[PDB]
Amino acid sequence: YIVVAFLIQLLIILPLSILIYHDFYLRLLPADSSNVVPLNTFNILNGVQFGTKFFQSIKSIPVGTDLPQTIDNGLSQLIPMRDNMEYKLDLNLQLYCQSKTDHLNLDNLLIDVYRGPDEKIFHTSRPIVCLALTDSMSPQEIEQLGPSRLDVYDEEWLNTIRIEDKISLESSYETISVFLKTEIAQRNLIIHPESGIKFRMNFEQGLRNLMLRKRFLSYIIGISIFHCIICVLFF
Amino acid sequence: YIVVAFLIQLLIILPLSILIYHDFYLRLLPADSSNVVPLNTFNILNGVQFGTKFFQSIKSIPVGTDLPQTIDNGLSQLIPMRDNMEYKLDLNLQLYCQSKTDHLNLDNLLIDVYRGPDEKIFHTSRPIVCLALTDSMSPQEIEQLGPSRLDVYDEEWLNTIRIEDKISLESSYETISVFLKTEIAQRNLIIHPESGIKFRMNFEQGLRNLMLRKRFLSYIIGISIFHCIICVLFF
Amino acid sequence: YIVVAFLIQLLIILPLSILIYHDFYLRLLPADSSNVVPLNTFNILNGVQFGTKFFQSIKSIPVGTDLPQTIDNGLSQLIPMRDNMEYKLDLNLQLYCQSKTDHLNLDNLLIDVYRGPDEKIFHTSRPIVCLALTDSMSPQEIEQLGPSRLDVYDEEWLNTIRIEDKISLESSYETISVFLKTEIAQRNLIIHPESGIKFRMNFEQGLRNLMLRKRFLSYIIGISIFHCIICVLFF
Amino acid sequence: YIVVAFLIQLLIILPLSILIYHDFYLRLLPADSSNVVPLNTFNILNGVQFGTKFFQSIKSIPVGTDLPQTIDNGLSQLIPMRDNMEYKLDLNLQLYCQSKTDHLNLDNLLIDVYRGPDEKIFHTSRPIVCLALTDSMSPQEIEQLGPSRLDVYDEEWLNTIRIEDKISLESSYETISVFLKTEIAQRNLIIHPESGIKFRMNFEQGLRNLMLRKRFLSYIIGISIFHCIICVLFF
Numbered sequence: 001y002i003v004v005a006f007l008i009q010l011l012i013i014l015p016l017s018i019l020i021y022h023d024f025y026l027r028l029l030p031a032d033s034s035n036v037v038p039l040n041t042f043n044i045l046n047g048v049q050f051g052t053k054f055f056q057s058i059k060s061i062p063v064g065t066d067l068p069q070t071i072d073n074g075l076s077q078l079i080p081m082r083d084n085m086e087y088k089l090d091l092n093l094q095l096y097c098q099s100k101t102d103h104l105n106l107d108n109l110l111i112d113v114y115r116g117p118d119e120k121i122f123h124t125s126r127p128i129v130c131l132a133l134t135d136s137m138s139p140q141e142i143e144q145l146g147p148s149r150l151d152v153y154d155e156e157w158l159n160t161i162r163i164e165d166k167i168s169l170e171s172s173y174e175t176i177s178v179f180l181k182t183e184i185a186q187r188n189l190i191i192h193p194e195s196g197i198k199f200r201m202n203f204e205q206g207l208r209n210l211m212l213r214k215r216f217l218s219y220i221i222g223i224s225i226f227h228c229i230i231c232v233l234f235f
Numbered sequence: 236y237i238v239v240a241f242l243i244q245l246l247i248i249l250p251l252s253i254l255i256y257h258d259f260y261l262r263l264l265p266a267d268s269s270n271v272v273p274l275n276t277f278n279i280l281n282g283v284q285f286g287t288k289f290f291q292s293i294k295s296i297p298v299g300t301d302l303p304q305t306i307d308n309g310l311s312q313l314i315p316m317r318d319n320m321e322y323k324l325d326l327n328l329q330l331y332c333q334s335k336t337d338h339l340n341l342d343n344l345l346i347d348v349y350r351g352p353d354e355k356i357f358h359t360s361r362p363i364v365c366l367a368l369t370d371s372m373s374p375q376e377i378e379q380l381g382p383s384r385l386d387v388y389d390e391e392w393l394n395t396i397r398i399e400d401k402i403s404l405e406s407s408y409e410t411i412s413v414f415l416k417t418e419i420a421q422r423n424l425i426i427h428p429e430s431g432i433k434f435r436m437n438f439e440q441g442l443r444n445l446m447l448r449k450r451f452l453s454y455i456i457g458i459s460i461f462h463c464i465i466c467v468l469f470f
Numbered sequence: 471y472i473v474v475a476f477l478i479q480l481l482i483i484l485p486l487s488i489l490i491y492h493d494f495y496l497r498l499l500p501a502d503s504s505n506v507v508p509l510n511t512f513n514i515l516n517g518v519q520f521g522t523k524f525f526q527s528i529k530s531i532p533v534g535t536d537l538p539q540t541i542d543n544g545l546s547q548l549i550p551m552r553d554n555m556e557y558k559l560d561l562n563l564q565l566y567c568q569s570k571t572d573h574l575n576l577d578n579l580l581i582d583v584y585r586g587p588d589e590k591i592f593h594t595s596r597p598i599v600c601l602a603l604t605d606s607m608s609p610q611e612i613e614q615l616g617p618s619r620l621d622v623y624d625e626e627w628l629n630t631i632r633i634e635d636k637i638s639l640e641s642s643y644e645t646i647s648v649f650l651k652t653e654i655a656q657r658n659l660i661i662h663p664e665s666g667i668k669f670r671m672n673f674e675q676g677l678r679n680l681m682l683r684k685r686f687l688s689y690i691i692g693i694s695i696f697h698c699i700i701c702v703l704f705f
Numbered sequence: 706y707i708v709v710a711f712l713i714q715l716l717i718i719l720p721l722s723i724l725i726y727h728d729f730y731l732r733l734l735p736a737d738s739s740n741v742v743p744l745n746t747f748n749i750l751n752g753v754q755f756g757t758k759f760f761q762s763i764k765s766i767p768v769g770t771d772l773p774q775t776i777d778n779g780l781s782q783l784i785p786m787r788d789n790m791e792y793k794l795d796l797n798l799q800l801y802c803q804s805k806t807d808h809l810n811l812d813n814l815l816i817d818v819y820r821g822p823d824e825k826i827f828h829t830s831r832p833i834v835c836l837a838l839t840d841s842m843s844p845q846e847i848e849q850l851g852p853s854r855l856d857v858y859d860e861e862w863l864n865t866i867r868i869e870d871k872i873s874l875e876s877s878y879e880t881i882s883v884f885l886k887t888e889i890a891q892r893n894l895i896i897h898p899e900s901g902i903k904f905r906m907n908f909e910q911g912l913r914n915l916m917l918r919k920r921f922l923s924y925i926i927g928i929s930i931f932h933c934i935i936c937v938l939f940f
Contacts, residue, residue, distance in 0.1 A: 003241055003470075004463040011455055040360065072401065074358035096362055098341050098419070131339050139373035147380055147390045150364045153341060188419050190343045190362050275595065307636055309593035331597055333654070335573055366576060374608035382615055382625045385599045388576055423654050425578040425597050473711055473940075474933040481925055510830065542871065544828035566832055568811050568889070601809050609843035617850055617860045620834045623811060658889050660813045660832050 009231065017226035024222070028208060033201040037070045039093060039191055041077055042178070051110075051181030052189055058174045081171045081199055089113075090198035090213075091163035091178065096153065096190035097130035103185045105132050110183050113167055116175035122167045128159045130187055158192065164213060168202070241466060248462045256454060267302040268438075273431040274328055275309050277413070286345065286416025287424060293409040309428075316406040316434065324348070324402035325433035326413070329395040331388065331425040332365035340364050343418040344394070348402055351410030357402045363394040365422055393427070403437060479701065487696035494692070498678060503671040507540045509563060509661055511547055512648070521580075521651030522659055528644045551641045551669055559583075560668035560683075561633035561648065566623065566660035567600035575602050577654045583637055586645035592637045598629045600657055628662065634683060638672070711936060718932045726924060737772040738908075743901040744798055745779050747883070756815065756886025757894060763879040779898075786876040786904065794818070794872035795903035796883070799865040801858065801895040802835035810834050813888040814864070818872055821880030827872045833864040835892055863897070873907060 025031055042054035056076065060083035061067060068080040081087050097107065107130050113122040137149060145152040169176060178197070180189060203209045211218045277289035294313040296302055303315050316322055332342060342365050348357040372387055380387040404411055413432070415424060495501055512524035526546065530553035531537060538550040551557050567577065577600050583592035607619060615622040639646060648667070650659060673679045681688045747759035764783040766772055773785050786792055802812060812835050818827040842857055850857040874881055883902070885894060 001467070003237055004467060006238070007241060007245075007459055007463055011459060040358065072359075073356070074360075075355060096341055098339055100338065131341055133339060135339070136369070137340070139375040142373075142376060142391065143379065148393070149340070149391055150362065150394060153362070153364065157341075190341065190419075191360070193359050193361055275593070308591070309636075310590055331576055333574055333576055366574075368604075370575075371604060374610045377608075377611060377626065378614065383629075384626050385597070385629050388597070388599060392576075423574075425576070425654075426595070427597060428595050471937070473707055474937060476708070477711060477715075477929055477933055481929060510828065542829075543826070544830075545825060566811055568809055570808060601811055603807075603809060603839075605809070606839070607810070609845040612843075612846060612861065613849065618863070619810070619861055620832065620864060623832070623834065627811075660811065660889075661830070663829050663831055 009234070013227050013230045014223070017223050017230065020226055021219075021222050029212070030201075032067045032069070034212060035067075035070050035080065035199045036072075036196045037079055037199060038072055038074070038194070038196040039178070040074045040193065041070060041072070043076055048186075050179050052191075053177055053179045055175060055177035058171060058176065060171050079176065079199065081169075083171045085171060086202050087169050087171065088165060088200045088202035089163075089167035089169055090165070090200060091161070091167065092198065093180070093195040094158055094160040094192040095128070095180075095195070096157060096192070097128055097159070097182070098188040098190065099130060099132060099185065101185070102133040105130060105135075107182050107184045107187060109161070110179070110181045111161070111163070112179040112181075114177045114179070115169060115173045116177070117173065121169070122163070124163065124166075125183075126159075126161050128161075128182070129157060130182075131157060169199075244466050244469075245458075245462050248465070249458055252458050252461055253454060256457060260450070266304050268436045270302075270305055270315065270434040271431050272305045272314055272434065273307055273309070273429070274413075274426060275428060275430075276305060276307075276312055278311050283421070286414055288412060288414045290349075290410060290412035293406070293411060295406055314411065314434075316404075319406055321437040322404055322406065322434045323400065323437035324404055325400065325435060326396075326398040326402065327433065328415075328430035329393055329427045330363075330415075330430065331392055331427075332363050332394060332417070332422050333367075333425065334365060334420065334422045335368065336420050336422075337368050338365070338420040338422075340367050340370065342420065342422060344396070345414070345416040345418050346396075346398070347414035347416075349412040349414070350404060350408045351412075352408070354408075356404065357398070359398065359401075360418065361394070361396050363396075363417075364392060366392060479704070483697050483700045484693070487693050487700065490696055491689075491692050499682070500671075502537045502539070504682060505537075505540050505550065505669045506542075506666045507549055507669060508542055508544070508664070508666040509648070510544045510663065511540060511542070513546055518656075520649050522661075523647055523649045525645060525647035528641060528646065530641050549646065549669065551639075553641045555641060556672050557639050557641065558635060558670045558672035559633075559637035559639055560635070560670060561631070561637065562668065563650070563665040564628055564630040564662040565598070565650075565665070566627060566662070567598055567629070567652070568658040568660065569600060569602060569655065570658075571655070572603040574655055575600060575604070577652050577657060579631070580649070580651045580653050581631070581633070582649040582651075584647045584649070585639060585643045586647070587643065591639070592633075594633065594636075595653075596629075596631050598631075598652070599627060600652075601627060639669075714936050714939075715928075715932050718935070719928055722928050722931055723924060726927060730920070736774050738906045740772075740775055740785065740904040741901050742775045742784055742904065743777055743779070743899070744883075744896060745898060745900075746775060746777075746782055748781050753891070756884055758882060758884045760819075760880060760882035763876070763881060765876055784881065784904075786874075789876055791907040792874055792876065792904045793870065793907035794874055795870065795905060796866075796868040796872065797903065798885075798900035799863055799897045800833075800885075800900065801862055801897075802833050802864060802887070802892050803895065804835060804890065804892045805838065806890050806892075807838050808835070808890040808892075810837050810840065812890065812892060814866070815884070815886040815888050816866075816868070817884035817886075819882040819884070820874060820878045821882075822878070824878075826874065827868070829868065829871075830888065831864070831866050833866075833887075834862060836862060 039054050042056040045053050045055070047053065057078055059078040059080060061080050063082060063084065067082075070077060070079065091111070091113070107128055109126050109128045111122075111124050111126070112120060114120050137152060141152055141156070142149065145155040182189065200209075200212055203212075272291070274289055277291040280288050280290065282288070291311070291314050294315060295318055296315055298318055302317070305312065305315065326346070326348065342363055343360050344363045345360050346358065347355060350356050372384065376387055376391070377384065380390045417424070509524050512526040515523050515525070517523065527548055529548040529550060531550050533552060533554065537552075540547060540549065561581070561583070577598055579596050579598045581592075581594050581596070582590060585591050607622060611622055611626070612619065615625040652659065670679075670682055673682075742761070744759055747761040750758050750760065752758070761781070761784050764785060765788055766785055768788055772787070775782065775785065796816070796818065812833055813830050814833045815830050816828065817825060820826050842854065846857055846861070847854065850860045887894070
């Protein structure tokens with residue numbers, strides 16, 4: 001006779017909690033600091049000496065002017081960012097790899113992040129796994145990793161590459177560019193559509209910056225704290 | 236145990252009830268305020284340097300006339316839209332991919348949604364899986380994924396591509412076009428007949444937000460009432 | 471000592487249930503509205519640019535004259551239908567597919583339904599599954615899908631294609647024709663013998679039209695209602 | 706539980722009792738009012754542009770003479786029919802199919818039942834399964850489907866084709882003929898020796914309907930009595 005009121009309290013607190021959580025987002029954050037810029041909004045330009053390179057110039061936004069938003073229209077569109085403001089990137093690309101030549105099965109993706117005053121900022125490598133002719137999808141793999149083979153490839157052959165806090169960019173610059181060159185052999189890189197670059201504002205305070213980093217973890221912990229305090233106060 | 240059981244039963248009961256309420260709202264959902272143009276009612280024009288393209292002209296209905304409905308005759312017919320009030324597209328295409336090139340079972344489908352005054356509005360790519368010669372169904376797959384091999388190819392090889400709430404098309408512009416190219420190799424695309432492009436009405440969010448605040452409240456209230464009653468009875 | 475009388479009541483009501491159900495068929499329906507016309511009663515004519523096409527002229531039946539019946543003699547015979555009466559088709563074809571060339575395994579059947587005053591009235595596609603030399607019948611498939619391999623192919627490789635309410639035909643026309651062209655590659659189409667086209671009379675009332683649609687579902691629900699009301703009244 | 710058990714036991718008991726009563730009625734079923742002409746008692750004439758054809762002339766017995774019976778001597782002998790009272794054929798042929806062309810295990814058997822004044826009466830096609838080189842029996846099949854491989858080929862590869870209550874043959878017409886062609890490829894048909902063509906008497910339905918109303922009543926009464934007695938005793 002009480003679990004109904006328990007659910008009523010859930011549907012009162014949880015919605016109120018997310019509302020107060022967005023209130024904290026509104027006050028603590030400007031609510032438009034971060035800006036997820038998908039790779040497909042850059043200007044792709046392939047090559048052989050260098051792999052796929054994504055580049056896109058930068059427009060400098062005078063202070064006071066409302067900040068535009070990088071719409072995921074997949075259309076090329078300049079990155080917005082305050083001229084007099086430090087910005088800290090978060091490269092988040094996930095991709096598939098594939099090759100007609102049954103040359104190699106595991107390879108090393110090289111990532112270079114230049115900027116332009118031409119001047120390299122960040123370079124790393126990540127051992128990516130690559131499809132090949134002699135790869136077959138076992139029946140048990142289809143049973144366990146979801147019946148849809150696209151979901152199986154997502155679970156098994158997709159290779160996420162997260163780069164956090166390692167890149168910093170000034171709006172006084174322009175024409176950021178990210179290279180992706182597989183090094184051992186030519187490969188077909190299938191960049192997952194939801195791969196982007198989170199342009200953060202890099203507050204001089206560690207805790208709020210970490211909260212901006214771990215958005216989903218904050219979605220967990222802040223909602224949990226709100227629910228617990230509200231329910232304990234009411235009880 | 237109480238909260239665990241209440242969450243489990245809520246997760247079990249929400250699907251059917253929410254789908255029934257969705258059907259109820261769809262019955263309320265107007266055919267004038269929502270249209271589903273089947274993709275096969277466009278004009279197809281195959282090619283090589285550009286993928287299969289679907290393009291259809293547009294007729295504008297002056298206000299006062301009851302808005303017609305795009306029938307499933309599979310015959311090329313014009314797309315009906317209002318004079319100037321704004322529509323927001325929902326591409327929901329799903330397709331098999333197949334080839335004899337024996338390129339491996341992975342590829343990138345480039346989607347380009349143009350519009351007429353020869354101008355691009357939306358672009359995205361989705362990793363799709365493609366049939367190949369070195370692919371057979373295990374006896375195990377047929378035993379779990381339905382005995383009808385069409386159903387197995389459906390649960391397993393179908394590329395559901397849902398692009399929702401991302402495209403907006405002025406009624407003033409005409410000749411909307413959609414492109415489906417494959418990036419890595421020349422494939423054969425088999426467009427499932429129920430694939431199409433919804434035309435939701437992009438009406439004032441102030442009403443839509445309140446409608447969302449009316450939708451959410453109604454869904455929560457109904458699901459909570461039914462779930463709480465049935466759970467208390469079952470306890 | 472009562473289950474015997476229970477079965478007596480069954481063998482009294484259920485035969486009386488079906489008799490009164492046929493009474494409702496006699497009064498509500500003309501008892502000769504629908505007319506299942508098998509494809510093999512058309513005039514098959516193969517081709518390469520177009521697949522198998524089934525065509526058959528139409529004789530216009532003056533009002534008052536008794537309506538003929540399309541006998542399943544498999545012999546070519548003109549379709550009967552009242553000159554001054556709207557008719558709504560139901561394409562119900564199921565088939566097998568096969569190909570000596572071990573090339574593709576899943577294909578796309580194109581269905582076109584013309585009429586003649588030459589003028590297209592319907593077009594659709596359906597992803598059909600096709601046999602190929604690289605297909606073997608596993609022992610477990612024989613154990614589970616029935617020992618008879620013809621029944622296994624029926625359960626597994628047969629692909630039904632139902633088209634309901636999507637076609638409308640006037641008797642003032644003549645020479646209906648249905649095309650079936652597999653598009654990707656030449657295929658051997660084995661049309662199942664019991665495939666036809668239900669020419670319905672398309673009442674202006676939704677409920678009776680739906681009853682005519684779902685003949686078997688009506689066989690279930692109407693008999694259930696008769697049995698329940700009779701048994702409850704007697705009890 | 707009562708109704709469930711009564712339905713289950715009825716479904717179990719109907720087979721044997723109904724077959725025994727069918728044999729009882731067959732003993733009553735006259736050899737003058739029912740004849741079974743084995744298909745091997747026709748005259749076979751093989752070919753290519755037309756499949757294997759079975760044709761037999763007809764002798765008419767003036768009334769008064771006791772109707773002879775088509776013996777199973779396997780020797781070509783004429784088909785006996787009455788002067789003018791109408792017979793209604795029941796083709797029940799069942800056959801294996803087999804070839805070295807290694808066309809895949811599926812084909813279409815065209816059946817044409819002609820009659821003489823060179824005139825067609827019935828035509829149908831039935832998907833049949835055909836042996837091929839790439840076909841072997843698993844050890845599992847032999848363990849379940851009888852140890853005799855002839856029995857396995859029977860339960861699994863036999864194409865039972867029953868065409869009942871579809872052909873009517875005037876006694877005045879003579880030289881009845883049956884054609885068995887394979888549509889896709891040249892196969893070897895192995896006609897099971899017990900295949901034939903029944904000759905039921907197409908007598909007045911007014912008697913047949915009442916006979917059906919006498920058959921149904923007797924079957925229902927006997928099955929109900931035995932089932933009810935044995936079930937009440939077993940409860």
